[PDB]
Amino acid sequence: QGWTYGIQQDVKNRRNPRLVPYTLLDDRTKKSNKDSLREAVRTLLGYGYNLEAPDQDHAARAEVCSGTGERFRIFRAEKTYAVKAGRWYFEFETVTAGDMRVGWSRPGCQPDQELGSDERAFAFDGFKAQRWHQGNEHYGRSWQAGDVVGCMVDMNEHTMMFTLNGEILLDDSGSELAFKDFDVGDGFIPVCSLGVAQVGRMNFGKDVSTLKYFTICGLQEGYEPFAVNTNRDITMWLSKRLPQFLQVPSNHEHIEVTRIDGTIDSSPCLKVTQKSFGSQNSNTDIMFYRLSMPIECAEVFSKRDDYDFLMQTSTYYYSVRIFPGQEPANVWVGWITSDFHQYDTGFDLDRVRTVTVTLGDEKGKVHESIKRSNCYMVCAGESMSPGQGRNNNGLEIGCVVDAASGLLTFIANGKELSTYYQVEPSTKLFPAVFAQATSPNVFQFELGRIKNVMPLSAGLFKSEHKNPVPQCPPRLHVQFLSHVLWSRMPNQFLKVDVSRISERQGWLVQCLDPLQFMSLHIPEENRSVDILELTEQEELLKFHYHTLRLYSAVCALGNHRVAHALCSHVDEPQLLYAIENKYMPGLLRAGYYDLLIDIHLSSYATARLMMNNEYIVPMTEETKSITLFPDENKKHGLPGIGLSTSLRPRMQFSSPSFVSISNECYQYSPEFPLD
Amino acid sequence: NQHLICDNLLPGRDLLLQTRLVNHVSSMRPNIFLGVSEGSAQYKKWYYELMVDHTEPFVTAEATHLRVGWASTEGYSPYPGGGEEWGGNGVGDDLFSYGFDGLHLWSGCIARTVSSPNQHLLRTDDVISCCLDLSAPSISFRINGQPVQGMFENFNIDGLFFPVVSFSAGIKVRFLLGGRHGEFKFLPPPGYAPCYEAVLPKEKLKVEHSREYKQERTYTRDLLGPTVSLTQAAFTPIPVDTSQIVLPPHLERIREKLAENIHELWVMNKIELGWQYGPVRDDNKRQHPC
Amino acid sequence: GVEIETISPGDGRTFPKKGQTCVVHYTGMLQNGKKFDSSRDRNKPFKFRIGKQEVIKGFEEGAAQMSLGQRAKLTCTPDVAYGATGHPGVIPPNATLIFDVELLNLE
Amino acid sequence: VDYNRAKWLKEPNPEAEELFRMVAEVFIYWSKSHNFKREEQNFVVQNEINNMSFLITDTKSKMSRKGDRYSMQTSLIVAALKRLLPIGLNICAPGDQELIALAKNRFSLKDTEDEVRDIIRSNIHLQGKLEDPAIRWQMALYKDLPNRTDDTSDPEKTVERVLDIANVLFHLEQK
Ligand SMILES: Nc1ncnc2c1ncn2[C@@H]1O[C@H](COP(=O)(O)OP(=O)(O)OP(=O)(O)O)[C@@H](O)[C@H]1O
Structure with a gap:
């Protein structure tokens, strides 16, 4: 009829409060209908017709109503806190009761796997009263809401123990050892896994008084709280909800990527093969692949083959060959941006994220409309459309991007497809393919070129910007969307005060205390992370440390111009944050200290150390006033304190400014706040 | 060698990793979920306001972040979809959020400058009116009662929408959701309902963090x-069909007796609790011609 | 040559005269959004005198068109900037510069 | 004891504490006589004892072939020693913990309890370091007990008890 729900009833807008689920419905109308209902059913019974229920069922919905990609979240300590010896203790308070596990995990434990399902973790699951390590057994009992589980590890004797509210849990036998024997390996860290609608708390005993049952069971057995000898909060890592693109591992259970060299008669190819096809537990879900480097469109849009046209053009091409045996309807080919993070089992081209920004003149009169999305792709099945023989050749879909105009076009087989896209300037597009494996051979990225179109490697690499010969350098590779990643919980959050001032004034949200983090940007992937996350990313940490070493080297030994240039890349707020931050990795900390010293202090420090062993003392009354001892009591004063009149090099610095054109600032080192 | 390496490596900013200090950004939203679906009882047009009591343009060397607008979820989940949860990003930095910062409309981490009478960045004593229409997907803004000549449209509506504000340190803002949760400084556009009307009867309106984790011990x-x-966000009443089932004759001529008995029930009930004849139709007089 | 968009309005009346000193706070970004310079980073306002070729003339004329107390975003093409040769180690060749400039004082 | 161990721990009861020493003396007698194992295997078959009717019954009250199905862990003596060790351990102090440590060390070295008594009495004077953060936070957590200090505890009888409990742990774990 047209009515909708509203907190207050309104005839004119057809809003009523009764349009709510019967579970949330108020009792008054509920009982008003139920009285007549009861009278009717009792009258039915009285008139001689007896009514019996169909059946009574006892079924559980499994409370799995969360997102299909997330059944649990894993919270662990940082990898650097791994313990390889001694006795350690921590606590896990269960706010709710449900599918929760707690224990010790190896540094290599994966965030997308159940705790104890493999060899990488030892866990206790009080939902079913079980112990989990590379299998399932029966151990202990089931907790309730508010129960505290004390986890103990003894790395000297290679034992693990669990207590519920201070009482030691037992296995099927009378043994108190949850896990009798295990290799030390790289150590263990506290870990927990929480299922759907589960709330936990992990206490590392930084404040011993906050522990509940440590004294009852663990204080006197020689077990140390996991954070007793720490002056700083333990960094938290946790499973990443948002999937990210990363290079396909060489040991992947399902996907194999083969790099095919480009001959004179062929083109470079990156072939994706499903190595697990035709066997148990083969991954039949759709998988999202992309190339590691993007094509960047022009900043400003203008309003056989020809060599001059190729040199002057900004049109790049690649092709994807869906092999025979793989259904084209399960393969999508096109481009994505760095904003694509949508991992869904059922993917359709009509469900991609999109928006339209419409800009008009003062009185309506729309003068521009821009469609913005992160997925510009086409379907191979609809590209085929009439049912073909599927044996003539692999279905070769060619993607063409015009960066000078932001135009994305597709070719099915020598014919231009109707579907096309228009992208906003400065967009970075990653060649992407979304495929569901229906054969061991799925597809391959062919990096060739067609008539009057520049090869993709040219737009990928600035060095080969004018090289018509297609190339596949080692930097270009195939990445796939995956959930095997960790997130670093920040040690400090913004202090936001929210309150209700009054009915008229609304809700007040206030934030005053500044908070900053140091961001590391990956240029090729167009993604930024926190530099504190490098504690667990070794290759990026090593490369950035060597980059800082190169920064020191280029300006070493009084290269003031290079130091001024480096002041643009590493500014003094960054330097101060790096030197003051306590969670920064040691390598980066040392590198940034060295960078600060070499950019702002090294020149004058060296000059003074060079005039150190020479004493040119002018004669003034200040010199005459100098005495060996400060007073009659011939006791040495504090060294350095006193009146020194010896000549010393002058200290001068130049302000680093890149809007000036003076060119005289390249003498002296750049300034820094010395106080 | 030093000059060559510097001039041939540093200015590109395309190979070496780049470092920069970024202000932490936090988001606040009401506990309101707005969605549109076939057969649902939810209203389609909503309106709210944000008024800025104070802001500091530069608390740090980086400009203060302050954006206001609407954010969507990833398929009925209570989580704000498609965005990071720690800091650095705000409204309009993903394709699930649509924000306004006083000069720019933000979506997909891309900003478009938008015209307005006396354009300026969000400052002290600024009133922002946000309007969301789901029948035809549209998000519109009005600064200080003046229309903003920019609009979001044709976005995904398969999730749940909510008001949202993203900010760095150095602000005092106030949500006005209408009714008893902040009187609107300006009259809402016709057909737009205040955001306070979306609260379910059992729950209570709140302004809370968009993400799960905040500053605590x-x-x-x-x-x-x-x-x-x-x-429960979308209420689509689907009952058990009764067209396929058939009424037997015995149940029918006993239905006659049941109908007469229940009719007697209502009539005698209105005798004992006080209905009677009424010449004119009025709700207060509480009388029925039955 | 320079393209100016007001972020925060100024007085609208006082403009930089000839033979005067503009004291500003500027944050410099490349057209792709990467920051290369900022006086607020150094916590020292930048002072430059009008008409003596002390800065890039794009910034010169942009600040000239600015008013007292005004904040504005200035887009400078390479012709009014470092141009094809660029700034070695900082500004790549043929780079369009974006500045967030606040005209603090006229002295 | 399982019903009232928490009362005895939250509020120490010296009168009830003597039970710990008493059952420890029972335990040393169990160590002395080897005939308990054989007669107990006979007693269990003659009069049917499975210790399960006490093992699985106590949980409700605390509100928290034959060769393969039969184990010895259900023995009343060993169950009692597990259920009564913590009270004596709480009688023991973090400072007295080191005394127990070297008592067990000399027991491992196989020095008789008669000789170690005078040695420990002499070593009492040599107190441990005091400023170290570890030991400092142990007596920080131990200071809640008002009159549990070695100043109030009689030296020689507590040393003898320390040797006794060191022998108890010696036998129980490593013999
Ligand atoms: N004369 C009456 N005496 C008592 N209650 C009445 C009377 N008339 C209506 N009501 C109650 O007021 C509401 C109005 O419903 P009504 O009986 O008019 O049927 P309807 O038009 O089908 O509406 P509904 O679907 O809400 O029952 C019902 O909850 C009904 O029980």
Whole structure:
């Protein structure tokens, strides 16, 4: 009829409060209908017709109503806190009761796997009263809401123990050892896994008084709280909800990527093969692949083959060959941006994220409309459309991007497809393919070129910007969307005060205390992370440390111009944050200290150390006033304190400014706040 | 060699990793979920306001972040979809959020400058009116009662929408959701309902963090697992069909007696509790011609 | 040559005269959004005198068109900037510069 | 004891504490006589004892072939020693913990309890370091007990008890 729900009833807008689920419905109308209902059913019974229920069922919905990609979240300590010896203790308070596990995990434990399902973790699951390590057994009992589980590890004797509210849990036998024997390996860290609608708390005993049952069971057995000898909060890592693109591992259970060299008669190819096809537990879900480097469109849009046209053009091409045996309807080919993070089992081209920004003149009169999305792709099945023989050749879909105009076009087989896209300037597009494996051979990225179109490697690499010969350098590779990643919980959050001032004034949200983090940007992937996350990313940490070493080297030994240039890349707020931050990795900390010293202090420090062993003392009354001892009591004063009149090099610095054109600032080192 | 390496490596900013200090950004939203679906009882047009009591343009060397607008979820989940949860990003930095910062419309981490009478960045004593129409997907803004000549449209409506504000340190803002949760400084556009009307009868309106984790003690912090989808957000009444079933004759001529008995029930009930004849139709007089 | 968009309005009346000193706070970004310079980073306002070729003339004329107390975003093409040769180690060749400039004082 | 161990721990009861020493003396007698194992295997078959009717019954009250199905862990003596060790351990102090440590060390070295008594009495004077953060936070957590200090505890009888409990742990774990 047209009515909708509203907190207050309104005839004119057809809003009523009764349009709510019967579970949330108020009792008054509920009982008003139920009285007549009861009278009717009792009258039915009285008139001689007896009514019996169909059946009574006892079924559980499994409370799995969360997102299909997330059944649990894993919270662990940082990898650097791994313990390889001694006795350690921590606590896990269960706010709710449900599918929760707690224990010790190896540094290599994966965030997308159940705790104890493999060899990488030892866990206790009080939902079913079980112990989990590379299998399932029966151990202990089931907790309730508010129960505290004390986890103990003894790395000297290679034992693990669990207590519920201070009482030691037992296995099927009378043994108190949850896990009798295990290799030390790289150590263990506290870990927990929480299922759907589960709330936990992990206490590392930084404040011993906050522990509940440590004294009852663990204080006197020689077990140390996991954070007793720490002056700083333990960094938290946790499973990443948002999937990210990363290079396909060489040991992947399902996907194999083969790099095919480009001959004179062929083109470079990156072939994706499903190595697990035709066997148990083969991954039949759709998988999202992309190339590691993007094509960047022009900043400003203008309003056989020809060599001059190729040199002057900004049109790049690649092709994807869906092999025979793989259904084209399960393969999508096109481009994505760095904003694509949508991992869904059922993917359709009509469900991609999109928006339209419409800009008009003062009185309506729309003068521009821009469609913005992160997925510009086409379907191979609809590209085929009439049912073909599927044996003539692999279905070769060619993607063409015009960066000078932001135009994305597709070719099915020598014919231009109707579907096309228009992208906003400065967009970075990653060649992407979304495929569901229906054969061991799925597809391959062919990096060739067609008539009057520049090869993709040219737009990928600035060095080969004018090289018509297609190339596949080692930097270009195939990445796939995956959930095997960790997130670093920040040690400090913004202090936001929210309150209700009054009915008229609304809700007040206030934030005053500044908070900053140091961001590391990956240029090729167009993604930024926190530099504190490098504690667990070794290759990026090593490369950035060597980059800082190169920064020191280029300006070493009084290269003031290079130091001024480096002041643009590493500014003094960054330097101060790096030197003051306590969670920064040691390598980066040392590198940034060295960078600060070499950019702002090294020149004058060296000059003074060079005039150190020479004493040119002018004669003034200040010199005459100098005495060996400060007073009659011939006791040495504090060294350095006193009146020194010896000549010393002058200290001068130049302000680093890149809007000036003076060119005289390249003498002296750049300034820094010395106080 | 030093000059060559510097001039041939540093200015590109395309190979070496780049470092920069970024202000932490936090988001606040009301506990309101707005969605549109076939057969649902939810209203389609909503309106709210944000008024800025104070802001500091530069608390740090980086410009203060302050954006206001609407954010969507990823398929009935209570989580704000498609965005990071720690800091650095705000409204309009993903394709699930649509924001306004006083000069620019932000979506997909891309900003478009938008015209307005006396354009300026969000400052002290600024009133922002946000309007969301789901029948035809549209998000519109009005600064200080003046229309903003920019608009979001044709976005995904398969999730749940909510008001949202993203900010760095150095602000004092106030949500005005209408009714008893902040009187509107300007009259809402016709057909737009205040955001306070979306509260379910049992729950209470609140303004809380868009993400699960905030500043607390280590041992007092609540770690949350996955959360169930909000099926109650969309109320689509689908009953058991009765067209396929057939009434037997015996149930019919006993239905006659049941109907007469229940009719007697209502009539005698209105005798004992006081209905009677009424010449004119009025709700207060509480009388029925039955 | 320079393209100016007001972020925060000024007085609208006082403009930089000839033979005067503009004291500003500027944050410099490349057209792709990467920051290369900022006086607020150094916590020292930048002072430059009008008409003596002390800065890039794009910034010169942009600040000239600015008013007292005004904040504005200035887009400078390479012709009014470092141009094809660029700034070695900082500004790549043929780079369009974006500045967030606040005209603090006229002295 | 399982019903009232928490009362005895939250509020120490010296009168009830003597039970710990008493059952420890029972335990040393169990160590002395080897005939308990054989007669107990006979007693269990003659009069049917499975210790399960006490093992699985106590949980409700605390509100928290034959060769393969039969184990010895259900023995009343060993169950009692597990259920009564913590009270004596709480009688023991973090400072007295080191005394127990070297008592067990000399027991491992196989020095008789008669000789170690005078040695420990002499070593009492040589107190441990005091400023170290570890030991400082142990007596920080131990200071809640008002009159549990070695100043109030009689030296020689507590040393003898320390040797006794060191022998108890010696036998129990490593013999
Ligand atoms: N004369 C009456 N005496 C008592 N209650 C009445 C009377 N008339 C209506 N009501 C109650 O007021 C509401 C109005 O419903 P009504 O009986 O008019 O049927 P309807 O038009 O089908 O509406 P509904 O679907 O809400 O029952 C019902 O909850 C009904 O029980």
